[PDB]
Amino acid sequence: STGSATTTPIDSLDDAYITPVQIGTPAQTLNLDFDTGSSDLWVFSSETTASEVDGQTIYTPSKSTTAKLLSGATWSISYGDGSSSSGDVYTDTVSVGGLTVTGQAVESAKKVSSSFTEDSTIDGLLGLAFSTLNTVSPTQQKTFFDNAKASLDSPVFTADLGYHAPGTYNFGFIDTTAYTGSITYTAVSTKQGFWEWTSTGYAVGSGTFKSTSIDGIADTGTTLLYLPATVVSAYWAQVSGAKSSSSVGGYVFPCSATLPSFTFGVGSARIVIPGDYIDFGPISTGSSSCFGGIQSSAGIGINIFGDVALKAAFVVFNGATTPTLGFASK
């Protein structure tokens, strides 16, 4: 089997992407944030504290003839941005772009933190990291991809995120029309539960490539590109007036600037992020200070190849017995 679904930016900055997902019988369609950096499929629901729902579409398990309470199971998750959610668990039928999994754990939120409430466009998350990170207790649950894998034509999914435009998540096949050149594959460590890999270096604008190993994660659920302080300083030094602002929480730059590109290495191959992809707009409405799309990972503990990086590529998440990542230009 295969599936194919369009993913759409939630706003004009590409802060995140939503993909429609059918849950239950009859189908309830929710717009979920597909997140290769976590492993829980959770939704706003009829159980979510009412004051914490503000415009989201909710899953109502009592209206699904295929929903079953997973007795005794609870979940609770905290994300790198400080947000969180928790609740109980049902199993139900879940379909993405024509690919159907029966018995998928659908984690129903009883509580969500303010950032989720405040984002009316995201009805939940669909985790696509390794199932070892799933938070369901006392019986850990599998991701949608893990459950679908055996049925797929090939044990892969691909992320093709757009810049200011829709893109595609495909399951079970590699669309050879969706990228240019060849796909370069690189090793993955699953030891931390992430799609963790080692970039071979970077370049700033037209500058020379610096060969240096940068371990990080391919994370569709993180907006920005978080890299070591040395690398980020080298990038922003090429932008007149750019500076790191402790009050804003990262590097800012004059909105009048034209930004240089940023290249990252995948083996001997190179992915070029156009400068425009690194502009995240005014820090507050009407400001002439703009927020940078490349930020330091020094306070995180891990480097993160988020959407800023991934949307410059066609990305293959290869879930073969030994997983690997593939990157192509597009």
Alpha-carbon gap, residue 86 to 304, rounded angstroms: 24
C-alpha Rg value of the chain to the nearest Å: 20
SS3 56: coil
Out of 64, 199, 261, 296, pick the active-site residue: 199
SS3 175: coil
Which tokens go with 187?
């090793």
Stated in angstroms to one decimal place, the resolution of this structure is 1.1
Alpha-carbon gap, residue 71 to 137, rounded angstroms: 11
Bridging pattern class, strands 303-305 and 225-227: antiparallel
Q: Which domains does the chain have, with CATH numbers?
A: 5-174 (2.40.70.10), 175-330 (2.40.70.10)
Which tokens go with 103?
């018995």
Give catalytic status of residue 199 as yes or no: yes
The DSSP element (H or E) to which 27 belongs, if any, is: none
Alpha-carbon gap, residue 255 to 288, rounded angstroms: 5
Alpha-carbon gap, residue 212 to 217, rounded angstroms: 16
Residue 257: closest CA among 273, 242, 237: 242
The DSSP call for residue 304 is E
Sheet holding 243-245, edge to edge: 243-245, 250-254, 289-292, 279-282
Alpha-carbon gap, residue 235 to 176, rounded angstroms: 33
Technique used to solve these coordinates = X-ray
Taking a C-beta distance cutoff of 8 angstroms, is the pair 31, 122 a contact? yes
Give catalytic status of residue 33 as yes or no: no
What residues does 167 pair with on adjacent strands? Answer: 7
Taking a C-beta distance cutoff of 8 angstroms, is the pair 298, 263 a contact? no
Out of 14, 33, 35, 88, pick the active-site residue: 35
Alpha-carbon gap, residue 267 to 186, rounded angstroms: 7
